[PDB]
Subunit: 87 residues, 4 copies
């Protein structure tokens, strides 16, 4: 019921149901996240910006609240949002 998301070495753990909330997104679509699944470690791996992920995951956990970590530039965080396809 729980999933491990490895962002450049930083492991985040959440429930499937938390992600499955927004099925249109990369993480919420089994078809899309599959492409980042690592069978060797049974986790998803993204070679991307780490500080941005706290906010991406919180978007799901909070049921829709998307905020930019004051410590991550707007342009950088915007590219992350597009990548995770939250829009």
């Amino acid at each position: 019921e729980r999933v491990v998301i490895n962002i450049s070495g930083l492991r985040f753990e959440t429930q499937l149901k938390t992600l499955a909330q927004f099925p249109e997104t990369l993480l919420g679509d089994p078809k899309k996240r599959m492409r980042y699944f690592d069978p060797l470690r049974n986790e998803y791996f993204f070679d991307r910006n780490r500080p941005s992920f706290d906010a991406i995951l919180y978007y799901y956990q909070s049921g829709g609240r998307l905020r930019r970590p004051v410590n991550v530039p707007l342009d950088i965080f915007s590219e992350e949002i597009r990548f995770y396809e939250l829009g």
Copy 2:
């Protein structure tokens, strides 16, 4: 005597006596926190905001000092404060 608290993959460790300080809180109440306890991993697990937790734990360690992390929005942090029943 060591307590392990897993916030979305981020591991925190403190002493039982540290949490015991405030028994009327979710973490200070063994009855309340047990609902998040994972016997097979010997840790409590919360599918919640990660940056907010440094301040939640500092509250107990400092003996009552509640500070909001400049990098966590007032409303987001206020939600966490409520959930952990610090009031």
Copy 3:
């Protein structure tokens, strides 16, 4: 030649030589830091503020540069400085 310092669950790793640079401090003095040694895990455990520690450790690594993390309140960081006895 390496030592693990566990700050409330957050593991930091450094060389003995790095700490030794300042023998007058808590971590630089074998007799002082020994009180926090955890045999069962082969690491030194401190039930304290996590964000402050990045700067405490860097003070040794940099050979004497003490900077406050913009994200840690001055009064809070000051107390940490006293506890680690950097003065």
Copy 4:
């Protein structure tokens, strides 16, 4: 195909090809980074500033975007920049 980079206990993971992009840098030069490789743990280790590395690694992942973390002083980050040889 994946490399582990231990920065004072904080583990980062990325793809060799990500680092290979800039062969003239310390991390991109297999001759320069070898000095920090720990054969035993199969990771590179640097006893350095932790907060600066998100930006150092991001430099590679972004294809050349070098941004200073708002929470890390200009002089400190410039020093890390010189060490990793990104200039």
